[PDB]
Amino acid sequence: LDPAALMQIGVIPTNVRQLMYYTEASSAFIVVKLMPTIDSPISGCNITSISSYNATVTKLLQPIGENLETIRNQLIPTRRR
């Protein structure tokens, strides 16, 4: 690259940066609870909200769930167990 010649036609190097790549990754496991805990005692009341959310969320994750199981059932390590 010839920055000096380029500037004579109005081309300006505005930033010069290093390139990074990775070799290893630090990992962490998360459990997403999609259903909140309700601790308060329920007496003579149907909270329709919880079941309607349950149903729709469950349906939404169906494809992901079916895919995990196919893979986990048919993609087998000859070394892992």
Binding site: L1, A4, I12, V16, R17, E24, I64, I71, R80
Partner: protein, 375 residues
């Protein structure tokens, strides 16, 4: 051959990144299973963020995105009187989270479980718990502020229990090594005045340089800092021989396009030095008092302390105490054939005229074919 995988036909048709993700998923088997093993304990705990512990050792973190909100607005007992009112707010809390969930989980592709969970998707998924998870789940030099505000974090779903509605996610923070003898350089253009036109050079705006090699390098899906570019992947693009030559200083191989000039694209400041198109713009020096003019053979003007110590550019008034490096190094002679449009409609028009001209040459070639044959 540790550790081979069998059954790749299960994936159907899949990219290398997908295959790679599949293999990482089945490696995660044991870890995901050990976590989901505690789904009963995990579920009973009423906490937004909570530790997942197996025999005094931590496997991960349990998060609940709407839990603190829920804890705050529900009465300590649910009666028959309450019901309507409590079904209302609880329902409004869950349906909001549900609406967000539906923005990150659409059923479009063959292997949905292998799609990366992005930081935007993590934000939605973890809600207000995300900063707490980043602050505690990673032990690096990289600040939480930087981890939250960048695309460094990425996740993969490695487990799921639809009954308990629990999704296990593996979050990966890369460990970054500087690639040797490599720079990523951003290029901008101010207008230049060339062969009686206000034009701009047509060049890639970001390039990668290693040795004598130069490639276009939009760091589009990358994490960018003032000194550093991180790319998960590599999106370089091949530059033509002309663009290469031009970037290496053979300026007669550059391409310029006429532009509608404006004040804000007619000059820059480069460490105190002004590079300005002083033909298309009025370059008024206050000391020594002068209008700096730009001769035709100068596409732009370099204004350092030897030219002007105090400059006015319209309403900007400032001093110049620095000096430019004075490599000419030769004559800047540019042809007019270097001035053109790279807009596809324009190229199309150009090509059609070139083809029209070629047809004339072809006919005249068949005509000379006759006068010559008639001898």
């Amino acid at each position: 051959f540790a550790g081979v995988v069998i059954g790749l036909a299960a994936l159907g048709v899949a990219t290398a990144a997908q295959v790679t993700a599949a293999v990482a998923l089945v490696k995660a088997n044991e870890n995901a299973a050990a976590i989901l093993n505690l789904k009963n304990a995990i579920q009973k705990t009423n906490a937004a963020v909570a530790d997942v512990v197996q025999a005094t050792q931590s496997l991960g973190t349990a998060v609940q995105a709407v839990q603190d909100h829920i804890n705050s607005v529900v009465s300590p007992a649910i009666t028959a009187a309450n019901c309507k009112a409590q079904d209302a707010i609880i329902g409004s809390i869950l349906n909001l989270y549900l609406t967000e969930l539906t923005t990150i989980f659409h059923n479009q592709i063959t292997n949905p479980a292998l799609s990366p969970i992005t930081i935007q998707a993590l934000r939605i998924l973890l809600g207000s718990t995300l900063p707490t998870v980043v602050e505690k789940s990673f032990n690096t030099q990289i600040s939480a502020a930087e981890l939250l505000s960048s695309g460094l974090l990425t996740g993969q779903i490695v487990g799921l229990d639809l009954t308990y509605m629990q999704m296990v996610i593996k979050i990966e923070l890369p460990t970054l090594t500087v690639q040797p003898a490599t720079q990523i350089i951003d290029l901008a253009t101010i207008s230049a005045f060339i062969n009686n036109q206000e034009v701009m050079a047509q060049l890639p705006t970001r390039v990668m340089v290693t040795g004598s090699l130069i490639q276009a390098y939009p760091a589009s899906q990358c994490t960018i800092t003032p000194n550093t570019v991180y790319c998960r992947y590599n999106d370089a693009q091949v530059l033509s021989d002309d663009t290469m030559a031009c970037l290496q200083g053979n300026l007669t191989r550059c391409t310029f396009s006429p532009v509608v000039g404006s004040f804000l694209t007619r000059f820059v400041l480069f460490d105190g030095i002004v590079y300005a198109n002083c033909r298309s713009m009025l370059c008024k020096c206050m000391q020594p008092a002068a209008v700096i003019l730009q001769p035709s053979s100068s596409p732009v003007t370099v204004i350092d302390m030897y030219k002007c110590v105090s400059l006015q550019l319209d309403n900007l008034r400032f001093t110049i105490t620095q000096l430019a490096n004075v490599t000419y190094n030769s004559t800047i002679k540019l042809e007019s054939s270097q001035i053109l449009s790279i807009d596809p409609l324009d190229i199309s028009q150009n090509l059609a005229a070139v083809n029209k001209s070629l047809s004339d040459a072809l006919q005249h070639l068949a005509q000379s074919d006759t006068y010559l044959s008639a001898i």
